[PDB]
Design a protein around this nucleic acid. Sequence first.
RNA 1: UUUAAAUGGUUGUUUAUAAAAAAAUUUACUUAAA
RNA 2: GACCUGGCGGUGCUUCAUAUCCCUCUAGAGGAGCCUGUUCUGUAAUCGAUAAACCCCGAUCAACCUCACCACCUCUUGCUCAGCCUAUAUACCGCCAUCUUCAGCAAACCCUGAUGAAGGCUACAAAGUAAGCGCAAGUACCCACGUAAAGACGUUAGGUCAAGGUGUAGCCCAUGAGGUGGCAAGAAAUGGGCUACAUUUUCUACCCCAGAAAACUACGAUAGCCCUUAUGAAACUUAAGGGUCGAAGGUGGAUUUAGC
Lengths: 132, 327, 128, 50, 101, 118, 565, 49
Amino acid sequence: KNRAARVRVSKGDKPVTYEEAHAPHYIAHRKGWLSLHTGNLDGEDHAAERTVEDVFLRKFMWGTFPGCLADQLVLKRRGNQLEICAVVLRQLSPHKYYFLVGYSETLLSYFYKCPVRLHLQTVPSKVVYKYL
Amino acid sequence: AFVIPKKNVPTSKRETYTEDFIKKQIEEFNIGKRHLANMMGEDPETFTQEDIDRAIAYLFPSGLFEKRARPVMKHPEQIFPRQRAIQWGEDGRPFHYLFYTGKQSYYSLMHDVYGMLLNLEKHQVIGSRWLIKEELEEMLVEKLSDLDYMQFIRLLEKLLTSQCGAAEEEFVQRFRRSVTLESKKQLIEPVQYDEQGMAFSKSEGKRKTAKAEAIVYKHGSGRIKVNGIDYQLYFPITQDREQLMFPFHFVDRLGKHDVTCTVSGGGRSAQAGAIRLAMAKALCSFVTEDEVEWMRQAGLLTTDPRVRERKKPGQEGARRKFTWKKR
Amino acid sequence: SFFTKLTADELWKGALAETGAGAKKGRGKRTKKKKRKDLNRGQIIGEGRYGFLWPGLNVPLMKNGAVQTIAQRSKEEQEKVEADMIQQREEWDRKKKMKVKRERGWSGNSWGGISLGPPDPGPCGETY
Amino acid sequence: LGISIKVHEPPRKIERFTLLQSVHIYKKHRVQYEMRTLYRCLELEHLTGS
Amino acid sequence: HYVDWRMWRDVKRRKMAYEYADERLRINSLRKNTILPKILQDVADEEIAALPRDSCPVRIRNRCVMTSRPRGVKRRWRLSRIVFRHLADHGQLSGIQRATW
Amino acid sequence: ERPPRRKALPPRTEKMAVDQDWPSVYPVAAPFKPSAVPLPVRMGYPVKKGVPMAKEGNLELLKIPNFLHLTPVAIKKHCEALKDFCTEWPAALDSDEKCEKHFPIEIDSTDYVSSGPS
Amino acid sequence: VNRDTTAVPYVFQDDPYLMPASSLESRSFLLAKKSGENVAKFIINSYPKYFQKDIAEPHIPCLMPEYFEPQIKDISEAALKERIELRKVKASVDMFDQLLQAGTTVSLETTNSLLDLLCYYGDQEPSTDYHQFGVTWRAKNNAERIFSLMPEKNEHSYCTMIRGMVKHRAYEQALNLYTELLNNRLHADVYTFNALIEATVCAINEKFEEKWSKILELLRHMVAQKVKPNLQTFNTILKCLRRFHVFARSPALQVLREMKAIGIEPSLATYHHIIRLFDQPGDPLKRSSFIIYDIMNELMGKRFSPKDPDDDKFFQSAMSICSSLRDLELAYQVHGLLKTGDNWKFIGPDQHRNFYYSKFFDLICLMEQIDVTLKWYEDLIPSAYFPHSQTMIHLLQALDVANRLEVIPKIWKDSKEYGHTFRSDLREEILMLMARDKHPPELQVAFADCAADIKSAYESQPIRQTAQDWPATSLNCIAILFLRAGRTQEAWKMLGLFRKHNKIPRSELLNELMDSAKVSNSPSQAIEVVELASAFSLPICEGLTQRVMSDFAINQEQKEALSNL
Amino acid sequence: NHHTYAELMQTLRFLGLYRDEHQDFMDEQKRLKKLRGKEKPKKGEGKRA
RNA sequence: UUUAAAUGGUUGUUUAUAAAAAAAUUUACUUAAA
RNA sequence: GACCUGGCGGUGCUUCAUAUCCCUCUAGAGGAGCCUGUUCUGUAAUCGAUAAACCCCGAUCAACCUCACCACCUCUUGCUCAGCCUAUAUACCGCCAUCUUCAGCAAACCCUGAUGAAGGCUACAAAGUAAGCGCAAGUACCCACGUAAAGACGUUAGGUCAAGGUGUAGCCCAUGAGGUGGCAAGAAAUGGGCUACAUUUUCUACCCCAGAAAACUACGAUAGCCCUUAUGAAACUUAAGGGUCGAAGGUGGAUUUAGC
Ligand SMILES: [K+]
Ligand SMILES: [K+]
Ligand SMILES: [K+]
Ligand SMILES: [K+]
Ligand SMILES: [Mg+2]
Ligand SMILES: [Mg+2]
Ligand SMILES: [Mg+2]
Ligand SMILES: [Mg+2]
Ligand SMILES: [Mg+2]
Ligand SMILES: [Mg+2]
Ligand SMILES: [Mg+2]
Ligand SMILES: [Mg+2]
Ligand SMILES: [Mg+2]
Ligand SMILES: [Mg+2]
Ligand SMILES: [Mg+2]
Ligand SMILES: [Mg+2]
Ligand SMILES: [Mg+2]
Ligand SMILES: [Mg+2]
Ligand SMILES: [Mg+2]
Ligand SMILES: [Mg+2]
Ligand SMILES: [Mg+2]
Ligand SMILES: [Mg+2]
Ligand SMILES: [Mg+2]
Ligand SMILES: [Mg+2]
Ligand SMILES: [Mg+2]
Ligand SMILES: [Mg+2]
Ligand SMILES: [Mg+2]
C-alpha cells in the first residue's frame, strides 16, 4: 500500500484541510503547488538553491509563529521579490502579529539579500474540508 | 458516577442549506455579478454567464486538469444541491398522503401512472431514450433503487404500448430525453482548382508517427509522386506499393488520377499506410456517395489508432515481464 | 543539522508507537504505554534563555506613555524566571499524578455496580 | 501602445524521470515524476529602442 | 552542525580542492602535452603528486545536502531520492508532479 | 481576560460600490485577499453532495497567480500614461526589404528574466 | 490610480482582524511593526556572521550588516578620524587626549571635526539600539576643555562652539564667545549669526523694543561682515518674534517684505511662523483674517520643496485658523494647496495629520450641505484618518440640522467600527436625537433596532470591571424608542431598570405609557405605571391616577392606589 | 552552510524569537533521564579507567 | 462409478476513565513661558 | 454436552478463469563461453535483502574518495550548547512489499435470537436505514478504447535503527574522531542476463532488383595476450580502439518463464 503524504481514514472524527486531504497523484489535477518559482522550468538554473530556501522558510515560519499557522505556506517569487502568504489564526493579539511581521520581513531580507514581504490572512478556525 | 466521555458536536456535521441561506447566496451572486462587469469594463445589464466564466478564467488562471477543481462563479441554483422542502408543518401533519412511505414523490408518480392505465383500460422512438436512473432521481429529488427504476420504466412502457390520449402522451414525454445520433457518413473534401483550372482535392492522413498530405487530381494518367520521387523508387518494397494501389483498385480507378503526396516521419510501412489514408480521403471527392460508403466499410477511411505502447517500469517491455522465480 | 529536525507531531507519533504490529493481536502489554506531553503549553512567545525584553511581544509596547526600548533581565532576575518556570511545571505535573478516588463497585477491579450516570437526553429536549 | 504583435504557441516539453518507491530494496517498484514546460512566443516587430 | 562526520569530511575536501584548483590546473597543463621536454614533465608529475590528497577533485562526493546520502541523489536538486520524494509528494517543489502517460 | 476577544471587522467588500474604480483596489500584483475582492468565487473539488469551498481561508485561490491588478480597464489606463515614453518607428522602413537595404546588419541578443536573488 | 476609500492606509495589514479599528490602534500597530524591525536590526548587527553570505546580483549594500565599531586600533591622528566618523564621542575624546599626551600632531581640521561632534551632541553619546526642561550645556564639558587646548583656532572652531551652546540653551555663554570672536577680528558665518539671533531673544527678558534693537544690530553686523542671510536667518527671527505676539506683528511683516525684496523665497515654515504670530486668542481675528487670505492668494498653486525643518507645520496651523474664522471656502483653498503636486507630503507626523483632518472635517459638517458632507465623510474616513468621538457628534448634529435622521443608524455602526462603542457622550447623543421627536413607522422601527444595539453595548460595557453606569437620559430614551416602535414587551422590562438604578422617568415616558395600556385594556398594567411614578413622588402621578381610574381600573385596585401614596 | 543555519536558529531560540519544537523534545527527554539516573558521565572520570 | 498422494519441534492473545489558561493600551496639533 | 463465527476439506452442485486452470499458439530459460548477483570456501578485513513477496536487490553503480571493514599510528570538552553506521525493524515515525490480475471496511441507529456468542435477504419483496473510506466516476497519455495512475480496512510482529528522525538499553582515554596502507579471491554450486552454435546464415556495397563467403584459414569470445588512447594526482585493475589469438559451442536432461 502507498503511504506518501496520505492522511488515513479514521472513525470520521479527524478534521483535514483541503491540502492534506489530497494524495500526491492530485498535485496537478485538484491541488496546486505550494511554491511557484522558475527554477524547475526547462533551461532554468538554481533549482537547488531555491529548494533549500523553501525548506528553511517553512521551518522558520513554523517556529516564529508557533501555534498560529492554520495551513501550509504559499511561497511566491517574482523577479527579486519573495512573498510569503500565510493563513494564520485569530488567537494571538494583533500587536504581536505586527511585531512578528516587521521582525520576520527584516530578518529574512538580510538573510537572503532580497525584498521579502509577509502577507497574513486570518481565519477564525482551521478550515475543515472533510472529516476522515 | 462513572462519566462516559460525552460526544462532541457531530464531526460529520452534514451541511444542510436552508432556503433563507440560498436566498442570501443569490443576492450575493447578483451583487458580485455587477462588480465583475465593472471590473472587466462591460455593461452590467448584458453580462451573461458565458462572460462571467471568461472573466473568471482570466482573473484566476488555473491549470488544474480537472475543471471541477478550478475557480467557479455560478448561480447558487446551479452550485448547491437541490434539497427537498419540509414535508410537515408546525402541527406536525405531513403534507402528502404518501409521506410515511418515505418515497412520496416516487410512489405518488407510480400511483398516478396506475390510475391513468385504469382509466385507459376502461375507455378502451429512435431519437428518444428512456430517462436514466440518476436523472429520474433528480426530478423526484428522491433516492431510488435499481429495481424501483425498472418498475417505473416498465409501467411507462405499458402506458406507451397501449393506446394513449393527448394528455397521457405528454406525461410520458416528460420522462423521455433526446438522443442526437452521430452520422457515420464521410465528409467529402472541397474540390479545388489550380492555376491551370485542373480539379484537385487535398487531404491528410496519419499512421503511427507518419503524416502524409495527398493531392488527388480529378483527371490523370495514374502517376504518383512521393516527396517529388516516383513511387516505385520511393517504395522499393512491393508491400508498400500494394498499399498505394488498394484505394484506387477498390473503386476501380487505376490509371485515371495523378497524385502528388508528401510524407514525413515513421518508417517505410507507416509512411505507405499514411499515404494510403491521405489518398483515399482525397479521392472521395471524385467517387460517388455510394462508393464512398463502400470505401468506409472496406476500412479505407478509418485512421488506424494502433500506436506503440509505452514501456512500464519494473517490466522488460510494454507487456513483457521479467523472468518470474517461484523459488 | 537544522534541516534534520522534525515537528512535535512527528516526534510524538514515533516515540509513542501507538500504531504498530505490537498493538494488534494482544502482542504488547499495557504497562509501559507512555503519554503525550505538549511541550508548548507553558511557553510564552518572546521568552528565551538570554532574557531579552522585546517591546510589543514579551513585554508591553508602551510604558508611561512612551515606547519601551530593548532591555535584558539581569542575571538574578532571569534565574527567578527560570526557577518559577520549573516550579510551574512541577505543579502541573503533580496535578496529573494525583489519583481521583473512584467509588468501587462489587470489587476493586469489577465493573458491576458502578453508576454510569443519567441516560443521555433525547434529540427533542427529552431528559432522564 | 501601437505595437505590432503576433502570438504563436511553441510545442510543450515534458521531462520525465524515475525514482525508487521504497526506501530499501523492492527495485521493481518505481515512482515516476514529470515537469511540464509550456511556451508562448510573443513576436513584436518594427519597434524602437524607447 | 553538518548532518554527519562524512558530510563534514566532504565539506573540507570541497574547500581544499577550491583553494588548490588554479595551482593544480597550471601543473596539469605542463603534463598534458607532448611539446615540453619529458624532463620538465617528470618534475611536474612529482609536484602535483605532492599536493595534499584532499585537493584532488575526484575525491569529492555529491551527497544529499539534507541527509548526507551518498547515492540516489538527483544532481539538479542535490537531494536524495527519499528526501526529494518527500518534498515532491507534498507539493512543495515548483512544477513537479507525478508522471502518468 | 478583561474584555471579550477581539472581533474581526466585517469585510470591506461590503462597503464597495458596484461602480468603483477597481484599479485603485488592486493597483499592483498582490495575493488574493478574500476580504478585498467583492466576488463570491469558489474553488476546490467538491465533496459528494457538496459545493466548491468558499473563498475565506481558501488556500487554492491563494495559490493562483491572479490578474486582478491587470484588468482591461487598468491596462488601457496604464498604456495611456506610458505613451509619452514611446518613440515613432521610421515610416520609411515599411517592409523588411526596405530595412535590409538601409540597415544591412542585424544584431541578436537575448535577455533572461528569472526569479531569484541573482 | 487614486486612493481607495474603503481601505485603511497601505502600511497596515489588509485583513479584517489585523486592520486598525481606532486612532489609537493606528499608532500602536505601526509602533509594534517598527519595534519588530528594530529587534531584527539589533540581531543583525549583534551577529553579523549570520548575514554575510551575499547571494544578490547586483549587490545590495543596504541589506548588509552595519559595523559601528572602530577597526583601527593604532593610536594616531588617522586612526582618530575614524572614531569621529563613527560618532564615538567618548572614544574619540579619550583617544584625542591620549594622542595629545603622546605629543603627536593633530590637524586643526581633525580637531575641528572633533569639536563639531562634541558641540552637536553636548558631550553625550548618541542614542543606540542597545548595549527636556533645563540647560543641557555643562561647564565641565569636553568641548570647552578641548577648545582651550587648541593651539590654533580658526573661524570654524569658534562658529561650531557658538552653535553648540545655542542648541543646548547656553545662550549667554554663546553671546560671550561671539564677543570674543569679534575681539579676534574673525568673521562669523551665516549659521553662527542665525544661532546668535536666537540667543539674544532667549537670553534676556527685556521688552520687545530692546530685543528688536538687538536683532537689528546683529543684522547690521551681518551686513558689515559681508555675510549674506539665508532662509533660516529670517525664519528664526519670525520664530523668535512669537514671544511678543501683539508687538511683533507689523515688524514681522517687515521681515517678510524684506525677504521678498532680497530674493529669499518664503517657504511654508516662514508663513507658518507668521500665522502663528498673528493668530492669538482674540475674538475679532481682523488682522488674522487679512493675513491668511493674502498668504493663500500668494501660495495658490505653488509646488513646495523641503527648505526649513518647520515646513511640515504650516498646514495644521492654516487649517486651525480656517476653523477659527469659520470660512469653508478658505479651508478648501488650504486643502487644495495640499492636494496640488506633492504638497500632501508636508502634512507632517500622525498627530499633525489627525489634528488637520479633525479641524477640516468639523468645519465641513458645520458649514456645508449634508449631501456634500457625506461625500467628504466617505472619502476621509477611514482612509485618511480615524475620527475622534467628538467628530461623530458633530456629524450627528449636521444630520439633525439637515433633517436627515435616516442615516443615524449608519453613524452608530461606523462609530462602533472606529472604537467609539463605549463612549458615553456619543451613545447619549444618538439616543437623544432618535427619541427627540416622533417619526414614521419605518424610521421608528430602524431607531428601535439601533437603540437595542446601543442598549446591548451598555450591558456589555468593559467599564463593568470598574463600575457600570446607565445615564438617566439613555434609559429614558431607550424605553421611549421601544414603546414607539411597538415592542411593548421590551419596554415593560425597562421599568425595572429605572427603580433598580434609581433613575427618575420623565413625564413624557409615563404619559405615553397610557396608550400602550389602553390599547391592551389590561388594568393590571395600568396600575404598574401608577405604582412606579408613585415611588418617585411625581406630581403627575396623582393627577394621572385619577384619569386611569376613570378609563380602566379594577375596583379593588382603585382603593389600593390612594393608600400607596 | 549548515553552521550558519544551525547557529542562527540556535541563537534565535535563546533570544526567545524561535520555538524549536525538536530541541524542546530532546530537552524534556534529557531532563527525564537525569531523574532516572541515566546521566552523561564526566569526561575522563568515566566508568572505565 | 474409477491410480498413488506421507510429514510439520517448545512456550508465546485483548481492560478501566477522559479532558489547560490568558493580555494591556486607555481618542483629538504647534508652540512657548518663567 | 450443545452451539456461534471463521478457517479448512484428496467436500456436493452450478457457473466460470481469456495470457488462462487444461488442451492449444509464439519466442525463450535449464547445455557452451562471457557479463553480473548469490551461496559456500578462503581473507587480519563491512552491513542489509535472502518462499511466492531475495538473488544487475538498497547501488539511476565500490581503483583512492565513497566506507560503514581490517592492520598500524594519532587525538580527548572533540565540525556541533559533543559524538556513536553501538543493540533492539519484536518499541516506532517515515517510505514500501504482499493478497490487489481483490471489493470490501463501515461509525451512528433500528430489529431478530425468550435481551447468548451472533444474525439482518426474497421486487408479484418477508427488517433493515446507513454518513464516511475503497471500488466506481473523473483526470494524465493519442478517443468514450487501451495503458498508466489509483487501489480502503486488514493479513505476513513481512522489508528497512545503515535515507533521516526517534523510544528503551549501552559506550564517553572510546563502541567516539583523524591519518597511512590494505582486503573485496575462487575448490565448488547456482539465479538473471549477453553473445553464439549459422544458409530466413557470414562479409562488403546499399539501406531491400548486388557481388562474394559457406566446415580444421567456415560460423563462433564483449575472454586471454600485446600495443595505443580516454578520464584521473594515482589504471597489471576502469573504459574505448587496434593487433594477435580462433577456444567451448553443432540448438541443449528432469524441469521451467513470458506474451491477447
Ligand atoms: K463452516
Ligand atoms: K537454452
Ligand atoms: K534507535
Ligand atoms: K542464464
Ligand atoms: Mg505498488
Ligand atoms: Mg520485447
Ligand atoms: Mg483492588
Ligand atoms: Mg566520485
Ligand atoms: Mg515422522
Ligand atoms: Mg504443528
Ligand atoms: Mg546457461
Ligand atoms: Mg553479502
Ligand atoms: Mg542477513
Ligand atoms: Mg576504498
Ligand atoms: Mg582508506
Ligand atoms: Mg563507528
Ligand atoms: Mg516489521
Ligand atoms: Mg532482518
Ligand atoms: Mg479510461
Ligand atoms: Mg499500476
Ligand atoms: Mg479508480
Ligand atoms: Mg521481522
Ligand atoms: Mg572507533
Ligand atoms: Mg557475428
Ligand atoms: Mg578481442
Ligand atoms: Mg594519464
Ligand atoms: Mg573465422
